[model samples]
Target: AQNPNCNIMIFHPTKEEFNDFDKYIAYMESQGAHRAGLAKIIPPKEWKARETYDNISEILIATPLQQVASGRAGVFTQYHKKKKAMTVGEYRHLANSKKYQTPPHQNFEDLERKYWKNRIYNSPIYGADISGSLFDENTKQWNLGHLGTIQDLLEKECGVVIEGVNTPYLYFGMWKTTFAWHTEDMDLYSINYLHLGEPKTWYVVPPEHGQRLERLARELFPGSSRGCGAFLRHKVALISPTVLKENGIPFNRITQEAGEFMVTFPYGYHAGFNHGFNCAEAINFATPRWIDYGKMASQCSCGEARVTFSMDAFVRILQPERYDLWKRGQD
Candidate 1:
């Protein structure tokens, strides 16, 4: 059961409000919506749905099975195994079929039995780059690439297409398929639009609680956290709200339905799973305010994988003359 009081903020924006992305987001933040780390925005009723995944045919699949052995302490780490490629229509049928069920295996310790308990069927297909095929000028406003607030900053200032960061990617999800706890690449803000699908239930920790969550995660997975400060980047850790509550970490739950958008704030950690079959598109964006977070992420001793782009270069591009002054201040 969800705590009614811990729900993330929701907004019903008119066309004008939605189009003026920056102003609307500023207003939302002013209302303290950012503290929840995630917000749901329902677009105006007049906005007609567009053809998103209609033309797509083949799609890849991920099989992140639940480890019954670890019980509630388990984190999904077997994402690379049993991957299969199938058509979209086939996947829809598979997701809707009744044949998919856990086997009657009582031996949770057996790897095969555990696999049957949470069968590695068509799991969530995430971060599938579709910008070249799905994106266009007309849809630029809603997509992060040309969204009013970060358009000039990411496009004009950064001047590169950092796929999955600046450019958009599609996600296909089904029941029990989970994305583990993690922040956006480079600690930038991310917006996920559910073009059409069942709801995705999200758990997010506010930016202020980010370090605390990391500490808790380290304590839980000591071996993984041994040398890597950013072990969560592996996208394999899933901690329940009950555990978080016991540890005194604040979190909010959000349900994102079709035709709605969910925004994740900078440095905020979020994770969620799908209720049923659904498709969504998401991209990362950075407002000028995110520069400080990006700077800190760059200098942090987190053995995170390579950054999406050079923050220094981006800052120089934004302010060519004052680059040295900014660099000196950091030193």
Candidate 2:
């Protein structure tokens, strides 16, 4: 309501055109993914896979339960008591300890099968087990989507090493599975690519009204955390676009199909559902503007969600480089 002019954007780019890193920055800066909701990045390949990210199948299919969870990802629940989330290692350890399992409907084997088949929660770092590289089976040369281009660049140029959350977050989702409402950590940007399978439906709010939603939630719920804006703190709070619109807040709905990349802005609240069983890759990155956000984020709940880098360190590293570049240009 405060910034009613806020809106969302959807993008469609050719395969070759979008591959260029320079153009990626130029387009994002000009088109305003930061202020938009549900930004769609449609590639020209008609949603086809260019290279084989074979390691996903290897981790999901072959690895033992404990190894995958501790080394790769943490298991989460859709709804339950005494357990909201647990690393694969913890759950495996608990099961081995012979504690009474709840609900009596699902055993350890059942839980394992559920992770593979059902989309109760996400396993975003499943790729950490294997080399995050895409190489030929025979030649073994470098290829696209192999390494973190944007993420690694920040490390080298800005003296920031954003591990954990910045790497590609792998996801395997099934029907009715969901990610509740929240912004990317520390209001940084996020890019999601559906590597294989069914599409995901997203509901988004632009950056301008981010505080509007947070304030609304705070006023309504009273005791919720200030930074996360989620209802009932530490729990999933699902909000629908229809419900928001009826309450006079603007939001957008979009179904992100395979072969498309979704770019979400800093501080934009988003929630989504997986239409069916599918695999997706998502990662976080920050542009130059994120410096101030990072400073404020030090004491923030969202920032505390993952490991982060120091902006002051980045600034210290950039100083000499900037001075040299400017001096050379002047000469």
Candidate 3:
């Protein structure tokens, strides 16, 4: 029998699967997307042949943003897009003291001249987590070409504004770039769309086993040389599924192809690697049903919540036209 509280599922979805939210949810629930609250939906192969991704390349390569690269173990340095680099401590101070300014010039001719460095990138954090919508305002070109995006559903149903920092993250990765095993901020659901890439291997731990892995991680890093403790300053320690299974913890592995979508459950412990050069986009979203999970996620975040939930904000933005009860009460 499957664990009543936890399950992880992965599969490919058909065109009918994208008909509507209820249908989407139905399919996912049938495959444990509702129970486990996580599912990977691999779209049909034609998705790989899109013409453009919102002309988004301009903001990616030409824009000056904080980019990270790895060198010899324990040796660190910075290639500043602006000023002289220093320790992360000093960087934090300097960053807090000033506002960043980027040039306002439009790239008229050959922004194509710069197609990003050919370096083997390893987990470089870039792109917006939230920005208006996927469709470019002026051009109206759809980025993903898939309808009923989770972001749209959340925005329409939950009434939260998806803008500014809440936009989808755009990623460019080469072989070996990795995302450390961590839960999404606020334990929110994250959907990653592999726009174009060689394929990514994801290791996911269900909710029940999440804490056990965290505990094991802590135990492994006990004393002065703990990995997660030093995660801020150094590369996160590599964790292998083989080692995890040997320790009696359970996990699920899914290799996402170029056109697949990877959806992670609330508080799901997931980490992955890019097999080769690839570009992907991801965004976080929530629905009314996510309230219980959101509550637990907020508590665990301990205030420094990334993409945290706000009941007050959510209440204010509630779509009254849809719900008959609109008034707030003392209870």
Candidate 4:
């Protein structure tokens, strides 16, 4: 193993207060979340954050999916494929035909001056009908743009060799689902950070453990709207990619509060995704790096998996060009 220092941990039950940020980790590990297997538990205050971010910056942070892939959120609705936009009928026909374009966008010069901001973008802008078409493709014989496909395209075009054979990605530490676990070549990491509502009930025994939960999903009203990673809720709050840190980042100053705290996770046994619909929950997956496990940590369970890298480290490895031009200052 190159980095033999790698290990895992699952700390004890911690807290129970939504407003009180101190109890996040406590509440998560509480109610019988297995103690993570890792090095010793370190306190948040002891984490030495030597460099204060002196330089002001403008960074449009990507949500979990976007952080790994570009802008495509995994959230695809069932109606999106049908391309359903409820209208008064007369315009509905025209909208579906693509006969009449949205007014004034085609003209370039007019767009540049008054519409300098009106740059044309290739947008599907799927409505209700076409939203859930991706999954339907399986039953109905079809397909859509997936992260693996996109990543492959990028690799082919840019010839960027992944420095590591496989990588761990940011995933839900507790129980929840994400819309897009449809991956094969990615490793996933679940940090399980929550100090508020909804106790996360997770099933974590490698991909083999899927059987345990798959039964639950199948038995709980099968053929329902529940898609992949339905276990995770959609409540996400993350550090701006600019304010990212490493594993040694001891305490996280995410919410506006103060107290002794830390996260205890089994390092790389990938967790959950908020893949299910309308649960009103979100899971946080913290990695030392910004690069998410875009589809790596799925099928297998163990053996020398990738540990989390700091976001800075992740960017330096993966998106260096974007990082190179990303000056840390506001206009």
Candidate 5:
């Protein structure tokens, strides 16, 4: 049921290309890389993130379980559900256990019989402001705190740390563990670097097709969509690729492996599952081009979900001299 031509574009950037992130991304955008909604970058071999697993192995975190059977059908939600809190060390042991590797039950009754035993945990160490701890400050490419980097713009302009947006988060995954379909906060672009792990499978729909996917999700999940236009932000829905193709929506699939980067474009809708034990880090970023999208998202959402930094404020800080001119142009 997979789309035959669903592979996303992959880039192997030279050191010069990778170091000048802005120019590289602009070139890719001009070349229509954004049309795929996601791209994979194979970084040069010498670039390595600092290893910190041993430093935080004993930290206790909540891990949500996904029913493997339901995950296969691509409709599993972990919201408000029971979670198992265990140390990172304990979770790692369980994640790599041979017992959990057996085939999942196909029948709902069989799954019910096994209960929580049939689920796999996708534990994420979210909002860990360990950028300085995990990566040397001098590393310009993937480091979240480096000034002038796209991901650092919000924090630099606003002088505030926006957890998970400006600050990076780490994630641990095992086979069948899933992240539901959704766009990034403020419709910002997101970059995920697989520090080391088994490949992660990603499904993405371009920004142009974002609304189509939303309409389909609304039609399928009427209850959740009752009055919330931002219902998809809930991250509780998952639609398989077969369903997407049947409904005439276009998508691209990507397999992100260790030491590679996956960038999800602004307003792009994406979701995926991990293949096995792995560790990854991710953070949101915005180029100058994302301002309009950010403004639009700001107007649509309720104040409750407002971005940590004010887009208006950022616009002023980013270009005070041209702020009035830009404001008049928009008006």
Candidate 6:
């Protein structure tokens, strides 16, 4: 009922309704933190008050290392401390810059005059397909507070290794403009998952489009355009269990899953979409550590294959503003 251009016509998963790998179903069974993997119904009244990461603060990174310094301390200390929400300029500048090193940092106030002055934000891209909005506000399904233990586990195992984060955040596509092509950024191995309607898959793109993608993404998402990631996208199906495999890699297929969870690597920048649909999607940031200009190298190729930036544009459209802040750090 939103944007015809951003409709998720089909929503499929790995297993039908009930299966082992289907974390969504499992969470439903336990009514636990597994909500993101599956679907649920949260009444409007409930959704009004509950948000996945309401306290996470629009721009702030809770690091296990800098616990006390973070003041409230720890990752989940109840976001009681409140401050003025920063503007794009404040984030790009005063809040510890990760992208622009120069002063008088980039801000939206003069963005129009500096860049595409006449262009207006496309309506379809604005609120086209927000996952949380579609479902419910307080929906515990995929709730950030739900993954408490997940962060603990990562800190225990990796300890600032890679893609090991406990925060509940992700990057979405933007409106009019598009973020350059690139891959996911994380430490160690991350089970990067999505909460969407139709079916989704773990995919990778070809090698080309690497250089140009970052430049495009930064313009669209600002500080996130640096393509330094740890994952790579190939034409191959994202190495799932049921799919067909070639000599060593799995062939790509357009299969949907019951509790769909696409696995993204540190630099794996395969496009993300609904196989072939226009819709709003949600991504859960599963890892820690932002690339120092990592968005570029983020699409790291392992010789097996390369990736692209087309799908990322879609992601940026859905969440152009915060994807960088959430994934790349408070930059």
Candidate 2: pairs in clash: 8-37, 124-170
User: If scored against the real structure, what TM-score would every candidate get?
Assistant: 0.74, 0.61, 0.59, 0.24, 0.73, 0.29
Q: Look at candidate 3 and tell me the lDDT of residue 255.
A: 74
In candidate 4 the C-alpha lDDT for residue 56 amounts to 15
> Of 3 and 4, which scores higher on TM-score?
3
Clashes (candidate 3): 6
Question: What is candidate 2's CA lDDT for residue 107?
Answer: 42
Q: After superposition, how far is residue 223 of candidate 1 from its true place, in Å?
A: 0.3
Model 1 residue 322 CA deviation (Å) reads 21
lDDT of 5 by residue, 138-228 (tens): 6867564452544366665557553332466677676556677888866788888887656678889988778899889888777667746
Backbone atom clashes (below 3 Å) for every candidate: 0, 2, 6, 68, 0, 74
Cα lDDT of model 4 by residue, 1-331, tens digit: 2212222232322222222332443444343332222112222332221223222112111221211222212222111122232322322233334432333434332322221121112222211111111112232110111112323323554465433222212211111221221112222222222222222222122232333333433343233314323221121211111111221111111110111122324222222222111111112232222134432223211211222223223344454553443223100
Error of 2 at 96 (Å): 28
TM-score ranking, high to low: 1, 5, 2, 3, 6, 4
lDDT of each: 0.64, 0.50, 0.49, 0.25, 0.64, 0.28
Candidate 6 per-residue C-alpha lDDT over 29-84 given as tens digits, one digit per residue, 9 for 90 to 100: 24322212222222222222223433323432222111011111111011112334
For candidate 2, the per-residue lDDT at 166 reads: 34
Better of 1 and 6 by lDDT: 1
lDDT of 3: 0.49
Name model 6 segments beyond 4 Å from true.
1-145, 148-151, 158-165, 169-180, 187-261, 272-331
Q: What lDDT does model 2 reach? A: 0.50
Clashing pairs in 5: none
Mark the 10 consecutive residues where model 6 has the least summed lDDT: 67-76
Q: What is the lDDT of candidate 6?
A: 0.28
lDDT of 2 by residue, 141-182 (tens): 112344345446566556766533234555655444567677
How many clashing pairs in candidate 1? 0
